[PDB]
Amino acid sequence: DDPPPSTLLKDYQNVPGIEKVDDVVKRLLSLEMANKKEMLKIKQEQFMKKIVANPEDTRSLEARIIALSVKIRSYEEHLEKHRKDKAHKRYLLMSIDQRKKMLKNLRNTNYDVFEKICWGLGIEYTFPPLYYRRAHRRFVTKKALCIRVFQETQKLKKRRR
Amino acid sequence: KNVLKIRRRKMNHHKYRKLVKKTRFLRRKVQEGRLRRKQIKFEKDLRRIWLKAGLKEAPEGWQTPKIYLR
Amino acid sequence: NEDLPISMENPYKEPLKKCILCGKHVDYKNVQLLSQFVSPFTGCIYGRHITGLCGKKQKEITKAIKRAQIMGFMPVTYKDPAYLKDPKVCNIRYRE
Amino acid sequence: REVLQLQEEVKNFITRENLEARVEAALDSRKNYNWAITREGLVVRP
Amino acid sequence: AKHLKFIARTVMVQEGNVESAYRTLNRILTMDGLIEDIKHRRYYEKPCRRRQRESYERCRRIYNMEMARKINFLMRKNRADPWQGC
Amino acid sequence: PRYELALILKAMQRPETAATLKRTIEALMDRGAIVRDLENLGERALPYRISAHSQQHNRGGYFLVDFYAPTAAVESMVEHLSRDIDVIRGNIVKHPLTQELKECEGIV
RNA sequence: AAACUCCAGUUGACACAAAAUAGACUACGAAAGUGGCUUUAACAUAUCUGAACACACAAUAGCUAAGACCCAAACUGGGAUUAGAUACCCCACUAUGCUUAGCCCUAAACCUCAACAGUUAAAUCAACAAAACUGCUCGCCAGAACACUACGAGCCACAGCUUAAAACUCAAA
Ligand SMILES: NC(=O)c1ccc[n+]([C@@H]2O[C@H](COP(=O)([O-])OP(=O)(O)OC[C@H]3O[C@@H](n4cnc5c(N)ncnc54)[C@H](O)[C@@H]3O)[C@@H](O)[C@H]2O)c1
Ligand code: FES
Ligand SMILES: [Mg+2]
Ligand SMILES: [Mg+2]
Ligand SMILES: [Mg+2]
Ligand SMILES: [Mg+2]
Ligand SMILES: [Mg+2]
Ligand SMILES: [Mg+2]
Ligand SMILES: [Mg+2]
Ligand SMILES: [Mg+2]
Ligand SMILES: [Mg+2]
Ligand SMILES: [Mg+2]
């Protein structure tokens, strides 16, 4: 879910006395009257507070994963509307690849933080396929038949025994 | 650069394109027959599979699709 | 020995030259300024070899002129006659 | 300082109450954005 | 078509000197590039040919300017021989 | 963000111009805008003849409306200006002051 | 010469087309490409390398459907020329160039320079191109032609694209 539009900008959230200003100033300094990048910054800060142990450290692998996850969500939201944007499709796919690489590094280095990142961001880590080969019509049909024939043989052997 | 190789490529391609135009009707029949034989070979491979497995016929509900007919 | 030269940046270094519009804001609504960089007879935008502007301000003036022309602030096919008696800042002479 | 400047600035914004008066005042006013430059790099105001 | 008339590309005549005004108009139209535009627009110029032409003209202008600068720099030495004989 | 609406209105008498300006600002506010200031650049001859709403215009009144609005408002407001019959031409730009004036050291 | 004379000139109204001048700028993007105005989204990665086939893309031309049609224009007609001229020149007019949704997957797709890191010391260095090299990785190459071919395989492609031989021949290329 997006932060409420009434939320203050990241840059005006700690200035002393921000609660004693007029409603007009509050609107002027909120997410309602800003571009989407400020909303993404607030999302990033929220995720950093929720997940990482030290939210001030932005150079850590977890922080980079959070930032790229927010960027990926932005790209997906863009592409729902812009179906023919090939450049942004490329950017989304490349960002997904980079996040998978960082997740692999995190899993190999810090499993607890890896689990926290996976739960907090709703990411499902998957292992890459072992072989990259075309699944053409002949192979697909043959594999389906082979699975069917194995099932039939299993049924026949169960009947026999 | 050698322009003669580019010229020879031009001549060979132009000569090739003339042949396919001349024998176009013959080629289509040959390709259709080849695709028929291809489909038959694929079906025989599938039949060999279920025959070796032990089943006397194909698995119930299985029908070998035509994966080479346009 | 004290007389040896000492490492130092050139103190006589002359300031880099600046274009006439350096540091000044170019607005599409300032048609008076924009009209100083177009041909009086055709309204065509002068090149930098004529205006003498740097690349950044040349681009700024070009964009402002196009914006003003399309938004209904500036004429396209001529310079507005109200600005024909402004200071001449372009190095072009028609021997007119 | 940003917030303080904006606070003192909002006091002169057009609300639904002063819309008529502000529109009339603007109709009784003129703003000029025109100014030219000289060969010496000096601004000459209209 | 939608602009005011008799302002663009318009020249006034001085003391009935029609020829001088016409030649000034020709000078203006040539200096603003309009004559070249009209002549070039009679037939379509392919984008590749246009790019090649502009590249050639830019490089020719640069080369000519550099050669002229070189000759103007070496023209200073061109004077009467001060050590004639030796 | 902060936007500037450049408005070229029909050359009208004072009451109609006032009504049109009030209507435009009311549309801005209805679309969630906070209007900062309204500036009158004056009535002047148009640079060229403009055809709008089956009418030809050679003179017009130039106005500027500075405001803060959500990004979704702009498109909506544009449509509104397309329907207003007293508006010869309306354009919403990003406010020029919001653009940063980067400083230059001169020609290299 | 044909063609038009519902022709031509001034004025006014008037695009689903392509975008003078700026640009003598050399910018953006992975490349292809990108040069009228505004706004909204928006240009991955805080080691590097890493694929004909995996995942995404890819000028022009071309194929399906619907739409728009000013101009241009393969084809197709007419006029003229020519020994012949169904080419070149003139006139008219299509597919196509445009939009939408799908395909096709090719270019002198070239800076004819593979990606990252480093050096300017050496004998600089076959030549020319574009100063000479080093470390590391991937891809590729082992005489010419047969051959951007045959067969096999894959492919929304069916006169198509990718991958890609051998036999005969030669002393060269
Ligand atoms: N073939 C595989 O699926 C596979 C799996 C793991 C690693 N690799 C590595 O990739 C390199 C290329 O292997 P190859 O010569 O046998 O492939 P190849 O070029 O000869 O093609 C055979 C198959 O491997 C795939 N392939 C090709 N290059 C690949 C790559 N870099 N990574 C993954 N798949 C690739 C192709 O899709 C194809 O289906 C090798 O170094 C190999 O160790 C390949
Ligand atoms: S020289 Fe500084 S802006 Fe032009
Ligand atoms: Mg890589
Ligand atoms: Mg390989
Ligand atoms: Mg390829
Ligand atoms: Mg294509
Ligand atoms: Mg047509
Ligand atoms: Mg090239
Ligand atoms: Mg590589
Ligand atoms: Mg080919
Ligand atoms: Mg074959
Ligand atoms: Mg082939």
mmCIF file of N, CA, C and O (backbone and C1' of nucleotides) in Angstrom, chain A residues 35-37 40 59 64 68 71 74-75 78 83 86 88-91 94-95 98 101 132 134 136-138, chain G residues 29-30 40-47 49-51 53-58 100-102 153-156:
data_model
loop_
_atom_site.group_PDB
_atom_site.id
_atom_site.type_symbol
_atom_site.label_atom_id
_atom_site.label_comp_id
_atom_site.label_asym_id
_atom_site.label_seq_id
_atom_site.Cartn_x
_atom_site.Cartn_y
_atom_site.Cartn_z
ATOM 1 N N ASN A 35 5.745 14.911 -6.708
ATOM 2 C CA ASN A 35 5.848 13.862 -7.707
ATOM 3 C C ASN A 35 5.995 12.503 -7.026
ATOM 4 O O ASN A 35 6.070 12.390 -5.801
ATOM 5 N N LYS A 36 6.034 11.453 -7.849
ATOM 6 C CA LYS A 36 6.014 10.094 -7.321
ATOM 7 C C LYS A 36 7.332 9.726 -6.646
ATOM 8 O O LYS A 36 7.376 8.783 -5.848
ATOM 9 N N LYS A 37 8.412 10.454 -6.943
ATOM 10 C CA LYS A 37 9.715 10.110 -6.378
ATOM 11 C C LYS A 37 9.743 10.319 -4.870
ATOM 12 O O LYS A 37 10.386 9.554 -4.143
ATOM 13 N N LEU A 40 8.133 7.384 -3.377
ATOM 14 C CA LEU A 40 9.055 6.255 -3.358
ATOM 15 C C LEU A 40 10.094 6.400 -2.250
ATOM 16 O O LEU A 40 10.482 5.405 -1.631
ATOM 17 N N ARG A 59 24.523 1.733 2.660
ATOM 18 C CA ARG A 59 25.498 1.016 1.852
ATOM 19 C C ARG A 59 25.420 -0.492 2.050
ATOM 20 O O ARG A 59 26.055 -1.238 1.300
ATOM 21 N N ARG A 64 20.486 -1.793 -0.131
ATOM 22 C CA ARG A 64 20.479 -1.781 -1.589
ATOM 23 C C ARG A 64 19.333 -2.625 -2.131
ATOM 24 O O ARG A 64 18.666 -2.234 -3.097
ATOM 25 N N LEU A 68 16.310 -1.154 -4.476
ATOM 26 C CA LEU A 68 16.027 -1.707 -5.793
ATOM 27 C C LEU A 68 14.638 -2.323 -5.848
ATOM 28 O O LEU A 68 14.002 -2.323 -6.903
ATOM 29 N N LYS A 71 12.379 0.522 -6.505
ATOM 30 C CA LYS A 71 12.515 0.897 -7.910
ATOM 31 C C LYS A 71 11.791 -0.092 -8.822
ATOM 32 O O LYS A 71 11.159 0.305 -9.808
ATOM 33 N N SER A 74 8.154 0.564 -8.735
ATOM 34 C CA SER A 74 7.869 1.735 -9.559
ATOM 35 C C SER A 74 7.824 1.371 -11.040
ATOM 36 O O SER A 74 6.932 1.818 -11.772
ATOM 37 N N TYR A 75 8.782 0.563 -11.499
ATOM 38 C CA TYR A 75 8.790 0.157 -12.903
ATOM 39 C C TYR A 75 7.555 -0.668 -13.250
ATOM 40 O O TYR A 75 6.977 -0.505 -14.330
ATOM 41 N N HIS A 78 4.619 1.615 -13.568
ATOM 42 C CA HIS A 78 4.703 2.298 -14.855
ATOM 43 C C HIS A 78 4.239 1.392 -15.989
ATOM 44 O O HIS A 78 3.452 1.810 -16.843
ATOM 45 N N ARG A 83 2.176 -0.313 -21.675
ATOM 46 C CA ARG A 83 2.402 -1.700 -22.066
ATOM 47 C C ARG A 83 3.459 -1.841 -23.152
ATOM 48 O O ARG A 83 4.103 -2.892 -23.233
ATOM 49 N N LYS A 86 9.269 -0.557 -24.261
ATOM 50 C CA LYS A 86 10.316 -1.573 -24.272
ATOM 51 C C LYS A 86 11.497 -1.180 -23.394
ATOM 52 O O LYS A 86 12.095 -2.043 -22.743
ATOM 53 N N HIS A 88 11.505 0.570 -20.595
ATOM 54 C CA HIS A 88 11.195 0.346 -19.192
ATOM 55 C C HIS A 88 10.982 -1.132 -18.892
ATOM 56 O O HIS A 88 11.242 -1.571 -17.769
ATOM 57 N N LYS A 89 10.548 -1.917 -19.879
ATOM 58 C CA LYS A 89 10.549 -3.368 -19.719
ATOM 59 C C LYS A 89 11.964 -3.888 -19.505
ATOM 60 O O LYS A 89 12.204 -4.736 -18.632
ATOM 61 N N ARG A 90 12.918 -3.382 -20.289
ATOM 62 C CA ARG A 90 14.314 -3.753 -20.094
ATOM 63 C C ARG A 90 14.798 -3.342 -18.711
ATOM 64 O O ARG A 90 15.503 -4.100 -18.037
ATOM 65 N N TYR A 91 14.456 -2.125 -18.285
ATOM 66 C CA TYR A 91 14.905 -1.662 -16.975
ATOM 67 C C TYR A 91 14.330 -2.528 -15.862
ATOM 68 O O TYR A 91 15.037 -2.877 -14.913
ATOM 69 N N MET A 94 16.181 -5.994 -15.939
ATOM 70 C CA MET A 94 17.542 -5.859 -15.435
ATOM 71 C C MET A 94 17.554 -5.614 -13.931
ATOM 72 O O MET A 94 18.413 -6.144 -13.219
ATOM 73 N N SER A 95 16.619 -4.804 -13.430
ATOM 74 C CA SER A 95 16.549 -4.568 -11.993
ATOM 75 C C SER A 95 16.191 -5.845 -11.248
ATOM 76 O O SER A 95 16.706 -6.098 -10.153
ATOM 77 N N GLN A 98 19.384 -7.861 -11.078
ATOM 78 C CA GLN A 98 20.312 -7.322 -10.090
ATOM 79 C C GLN A 98 19.848 -7.631 -8.673
ATOM 80 O O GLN A 98 20.665 -7.957 -7.800
ATOM 81 N N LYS A 101 20.668 -11.179 -7.913
ATOM 82 C CA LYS A 101 22.087 -11.341 -7.609
ATOM 83 C C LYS A 101 22.406 -10.890 -6.186
ATOM 84 O O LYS A 101 23.132 -11.579 -5.454
ATOM 85 N N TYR A 132 19.560 -24.199 -19.780
ATOM 86 C CA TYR A 132 18.861 -23.197 -20.578
ATOM 87 C C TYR A 132 18.797 -23.713 -22.009
ATOM 88 O O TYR A 132 19.777 -23.622 -22.754
ATOM 89 N N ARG A 134 15.807 -24.604 -25.436
ATOM 90 C CA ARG A 134 14.486 -24.322 -25.977
ATOM 91 C C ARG A 134 13.551 -25.499 -25.745
ATOM 92 O O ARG A 134 13.901 -26.649 -26.021
ATOM 93 N N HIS A 136 10.832 -26.699 -27.366
ATOM 94 C CA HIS A 136 10.060 -26.664 -28.598
ATOM 95 C C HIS A 136 8.933 -27.697 -28.558
ATOM 96 O O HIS A 136 8.796 -28.475 -27.613
ATOM 97 N N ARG A 137 8.110 -27.685 -29.609
ATOM 98 C CA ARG A 137 6.878 -28.469 -29.614
ATOM 99 C C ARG A 137 7.162 -29.958 -29.464
ATOM 100 O O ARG A 137 6.484 -30.659 -28.702
ATOM 101 N N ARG A 138 8.163 -30.461 -30.188
ATOM 102 C CA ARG A 138 8.480 -31.883 -30.128
ATOM 103 C C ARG A 138 8.846 -32.302 -28.710
ATOM 104 O O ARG A 138 8.310 -33.283 -28.183
ATOM 105 P P G G 29 21.809 8.581 -21.117
ATOM 106 O "O5'" G G 29 21.228 7.403 -22.016
ATOM 107 C "C5'" G G 29 19.894 6.953 -21.849
ATOM 108 C "C4'" G G 29 19.470 6.029 -22.962
ATOM 109 C "C3'" G G 29 20.336 4.801 -23.197
ATOM 110 O "O3'" G G 29 20.089 3.750 -22.280
ATOM 111 C "C1'" G G 29 19.842 5.827 -25.265
ATOM 112 P P A G 30 21.307 2.947 -21.601
ATOM 113 O "O5'" A G 30 22.040 2.222 -22.818
ATOM 114 C "C5'" A G 30 23.302 1.590 -22.641
ATOM 115 C "C4'" A G 30 23.541 0.515 -23.673
ATOM 116 C "C3'" A G 30 23.266 0.909 -25.117
ATOM 117 O "O3'" A G 30 24.375 1.556 -25.715
ATOM 118 C "C1'" A G 30 22.200 -1.147 -24.646
ATOM 119 P P U G 40 4.773 17.614 -14.518
ATOM 120 O "O5'" U G 40 4.202 16.136 -14.654
ATOM 121 C "C5'" U G 40 2.921 15.797 -14.145
ATOM 122 C "C4'" U G 40 2.605 14.340 -14.365
ATOM 123 C "C3'" U G 40 3.700 13.360 -13.979
ATOM 124 O "O3'" U G 40 3.710 13.088 -12.589
ATOM 125 C "C1'" U G 40 2.848 12.797 -16.115
ATOM 126 P P A G 41 4.896 12.230 -11.936
ATOM 127 O "O5'" A G 41 4.721 10.795 -12.597
ATOM 128 C "C5'" A G 41 5.614 9.748 -12.279
ATOM 129 C "C4'" A G 41 5.536 8.624 -13.275
ATOM 130 C "C3'" A G 41 6.855 7.936 -13.571
ATOM 131 O "O3'" A G 41 7.218 7.005 -12.571
ATOM 132 C "C1'" A G 41 5.751 8.406 -15.598
ATOM 133 P P A G 42 8.535 7.259 -11.693
ATOM 134 O "O5'" A G 42 9.721 6.994 -12.720
ATOM 135 C "C5'" A G 42 9.754 5.803 -13.491
ATOM 136 C "C4'" A G 42 10.559 5.976 -14.751
ATOM 137 C "C3'" A G 42 11.968 6.514 -14.581
ATOM 138 O "O3'" A G 42 12.886 5.527 -14.145
ATOM 139 C "C1'" A G 42 10.909 7.640 -16.364
ATOM 140 P P C G 43 14.240 5.944 -13.390
ATOM 141 O "O5'" C G 43 15.360 5.782 -14.507
ATOM 142 C "C5'" C G 43 15.563 4.534 -15.150
ATOM 143 C "C4'" C G 43 16.380 4.684 -16.404
ATOM 144 C "C3'" C G 43 17.780 5.247 -16.229
ATOM 145 O "O3'" C G 43 18.713 4.254 -15.839
ATOM 146 C "C1'" C G 43 16.694 6.315 -18.054
ATOM 147 P P A G 44 19.256 4.177 -14.331
ATOM 148 O "O5'" A G 44 19.170 2.630 -13.969
ATOM 149 C "C5'" A G 44 17.973 2.065 -13.451
ATOM 150 C "C4'" A G 44 18.186 0.647 -12.986
ATOM 151 C "C3'" A G 44 19.434 0.399 -12.154
ATOM 152 O "O3'" A G 44 19.243 0.725 -10.789
ATOM 153 C "C1'" A G 44 19.235 -1.271 -13.829
ATOM 154 P P U G 45 20.379 1.499 -9.964
ATOM 155 O "O5'" U G 45 21.472 0.383 -9.678
ATOM 156 C "C5'" U G 45 21.139 -0.805 -8.978
ATOM 157 C "C4'" U G 45 22.251 -1.814 -9.071
ATOM 158 C "C3'" U G 45 23.644 -1.289 -8.757
ATOM 159 O "O3'" U G 45 23.909 -1.262 -7.366
ATOM 160 C "C1'" U G 45 23.698 -2.545 -10.766
ATOM 161 P P A G 46 24.328 0.102 -6.626
ATOM 162 O "O5'" A G 46 25.869 0.296 -6.982
ATOM 163 C "C5'" A G 46 26.701 -0.812 -7.314
ATOM 164 C "C4'" A G 46 27.978 -0.818 -6.510
ATOM 165 C "C3'" A G 46 27.933 -1.630 -5.217
ATOM 166 O "O3'" A G 46 29.198 -2.250 -4.993
ATOM 167 C "C1'" A G 46 28.440 0.624 -4.717
ATOM 168 P P U G 47 29.343 -3.845 -5.102
ATOM 169 O "O5'" U G 47 30.684 -4.051 -5.932
ATOM 170 C "C5'" U G 47 30.645 -4.184 -7.343
ATOM 171 C "C4'" U G 47 32.027 -4.166 -7.938
ATOM 172 C "C3'" U G 47 32.134 -4.671 -9.368
ATOM 173 O "O3'" U G 47 31.815 -3.670 -10.318
ATOM 174 C "C1'" U G 47 33.813 -5.680 -8.037
ATOM 175 P P U G 49 31.874 -5.978 -17.088
ATOM 176 O "O5'" U G 49 32.359 -7.431 -17.512
ATOM 177 C "C5'" U G 49 33.488 -7.609 -18.352
ATOM 178 C "C4'" U G 49 33.778 -9.070 -18.579
ATOM 179 C "C3'" U G 49 32.622 -9.895 -19.113
ATOM 180 O "O3'" U G 49 32.481 -9.786 -20.518
ATOM 181 C "C1'" U G 49 33.654 -11.038 -17.313
ATOM 182 P P G G 50 31.028 -9.658 -21.181
ATOM 183 O "O5'" G G 50 30.386 -11.099 -20.983
ATOM 184 C "C5'" G G 50 31.028 -12.265 -21.479
ATOM 185 C "C4'" G G 50 30.485 -13.508 -20.824
ATOM 186 C "C3'" G G 50 28.991 -13.739 -20.985
ATOM 187 O "O3'" G G 50 28.679 -14.408 -22.194
ATOM 188 C "C1'" G G 50 29.606 -14.005 -18.707
ATOM 189 P P A G 51 28.349 -13.589 -23.533
ATOM 190 O "O5'" A G 51 27.499 -14.618 -24.399
ATOM 191 C "C5'" A G 51 28.035 -15.887 -24.764
ATOM 192 C "C4'" A G 51 26.956 -16.845 -25.205
ATOM 193 C "C3'" A G 51 25.928 -16.265 -26.179
ATOM 194 O "O3'" A G 51 25.487 -17.276 -27.083
ATOM 195 C "C1'" A G 51 24.821 -17.074 -24.280
ATOM 196 P P C G 53 21.308 -16.716 -28.375
ATOM 197 O "O5'" C G 53 20.498 -18.002 -28.834
ATOM 198 C "C5'" C G 53 19.352 -17.897 -29.670
ATOM 199 C "C4'" C G 53 18.554 -19.172 -29.625
ATOM 200 C "C3'" C G 53 18.152 -19.611 -28.219
ATOM 201 O "O3'" C G 53 16.892 -20.279 -28.242
ATOM 202 C "C1'" C G 53 19.589 -21.233 -29.178
ATOM 203 P P A G 54 15.700 -19.745 -27.312
ATOM 204 O "O5'" A G 54 16.352 -19.668 -25.862
ATOM 205 C "C5'" A G 54 16.196 -20.717 -24.916
ATOM 206 C "C4'" A G 54 16.303 -20.197 -23.507
ATOM 207 C "C3'" A G 54 15.584 -18.884 -23.239
ATOM 208 O "O3'" A G 54 14.215 -19.090 -22.943
ATOM 209 C "C1'" A G 54 17.783 -18.808 -22.334
ATOM 210 P P C G 55 13.090 -18.118 -23.544
ATOM 211 O "O5'" C G 55 13.353 -16.739 -22.802
ATOM 212 C "C5'" C G 55 13.240 -16.641 -21.391
ATOM 213 C "C4'" C G 55 13.495 -15.235 -20.921
ATOM 214 C "C3'" C G 55 12.937 -14.136 -21.807
ATOM 215 O "O3'" C G 55 11.560 -13.907 -21.570
ATOM 216 C "C1'" C G 55 15.171 -13.625 -21.206
ATOM 217 P P A G 56 10.672 -13.119 -22.646
ATOM 218 O "O5'" A G 56 11.040 -11.597 -22.377
ATOM 219 C "C5'" A G 56 10.955 -10.632 -23.409
ATOM 220 C "C4'" A G 56 11.865 -9.466 -23.138
ATOM 221 C "C3'" A G 56 12.029 -8.484 -24.283
ATOM 222 O "O3'" A G 56 10.970 -7.544 -24.335
ATOM 223 C "C1'" A G 56 14.154 -9.036 -23.397
ATOM 224 P P C G 57 9.923 -7.532 -25.555
ATOM 225 O "O5'" C G 57 10.476 -6.390 -26.510
ATOM 226 C "C5'" C G 57 11.517 -6.660 -27.430
ATOM 227 C "C4'" C G 57 12.616 -5.635 -27.351
ATOM 228 C "C3'" C G 57 12.998 -5.001 -28.680
ATOM 229 O "O3'" C G 57 12.182 -3.883 -28.988
ATOM 230 C "C1'" C G 57 14.942 -5.822 -27.618
ATOM 231 P P A G 58 11.863 -3.495 -30.510
ATOM 232 O "O5'" A G 58 13.265 -2.972 -31.055
ATOM 233 C "C5'" A G 58 13.420 -2.547 -32.396
ATOM 234 C "C4'" A G 58 14.813 -2.822 -32.890
ATOM 235 C "C3'" A G 58 14.922 -3.381 -34.298
ATOM 236 O "O3'" A G 58 14.830 -2.382 -35.296
ATOM 237 C "C1'" A G 58 16.246 -4.676 -32.848
ATOM 238 P P U G 100 0.080 3.899 -32.627
ATOM 239 O "O5'" U G 100 -1.116 2.875 -32.431
ATOM 240 C "C5'" U G 100 -2.328 3.283 -31.820
ATOM 241 C "C4'" U G 100 -3.395 2.232 -31.970
ATOM 242 C "C3'" U G 100 -2.952 0.808 -31.701
ATOM 243 O "O3'" U G 100 -2.870 0.511 -30.318
ATOM 244 C "C1'" U G 100 -4.217 0.869 -33.689
ATOM 245 P P A G 101 -1.614 -0.306 -29.741
ATOM 246 O "O5'" A G 101 -1.965 -1.814 -30.098
ATOM 247 C "C5'" A G 101 -3.207 -2.375 -29.704
ATOM 248 C "C4'" A G 101 -3.430 -3.725 -30.332
ATOM 249 C "C3'" A G 101 -2.229 -4.651 -30.364
ATOM 250 O "O3'" A G 101 -2.018 -5.299 -29.123
ATOM 251 C "C1'" A G 101 -3.331 -4.686 -32.463
ATOM 252 P P G G 102 -0.698 -6.175 -28.886
ATOM 253 O "O5'" G G 102 -0.853 -7.368 -29.925
ATOM 254 C "C5'" G G 102 0.284 -7.921 -30.561
ATOM 255 C "C4'" G G 102 -0.104 -8.858 -31.672
ATOM 256 C "C3'" G G 102 1.042 -9.628 -32.296
ATOM 257 O "O3'" G G 102 1.411 -10.756 -31.525
ATOM 258 C "C1'" G G 102 -0.313 -8.714 -34.002
ATOM 259 P P A G 153 14.486 -33.167 -39.204
ATOM 260 O "O5'" A G 153 14.800 -32.092 -38.073
ATOM 261 C "C5'" A G 153 15.279 -32.502 -36.802
ATOM 262 C "C4'" A G 153 15.747 -31.336 -35.971
ATOM 263 C "C3'" A G 153 14.760 -30.197 -35.787
ATOM 264 O "O3'" A G 153 13.764 -30.472 -34.818
ATOM 265 C "C1'" A G 153 16.872 -29.310 -36.329
ATOM 266 P P G G 154 12.281 -29.871 -34.982
ATOM 267 O "O5'" G G 154 12.428 -28.358 -34.518
ATOM 268 C "C5'" G G 154 12.962 -28.037 -33.245
ATOM 269 C "C4'" G G 154 13.268 -26.567 -33.131
ATOM 270 C "C3'" G G 154 12.170 -25.623 -33.583
ATOM 271 O "O3'" G G 154 11.143 -25.461 -32.622
ATOM 272 C "C1'" G G 154 14.229 -24.913 -34.485
ATOM 273 P P C G 155 9.608 -25.362 -33.084
ATOM 274 O "O5'" C G 155 9.468 -23.867 -33.608
ATOM 275 C "C5'" C G 155 9.794 -22.776 -32.762
ATOM 276 C "C4'" C G 155 10.099 -21.528 -33.549
ATOM 277 C "C3'" C G 155 8.990 -21.005 -34.444
ATOM 278 O "O3'" C G 155 7.993 -20.293 -33.730
ATOM 279 C "C1'" C G 155 11.046 -20.961 -35.614
ATOM 280 P P C G 156 6.517 -20.910 -33.549
ATOM 281 O "O5'" C G 156 5.762 -20.496 -34.885
ATOM 282 C "C5'" C G 156 6.212 -19.382 -35.644
ATOM 283 C "C4'" C G 156 5.210 -18.950 -36.683
ATOM 284 C "C3'" C G 156 5.646 -17.735 -37.490
ATOM 285 O "O3'" C G 156 5.471 -17.925 -38.901
ATOM 286 C "C1'" C G 156 3.632 -17.247 -36.246
#
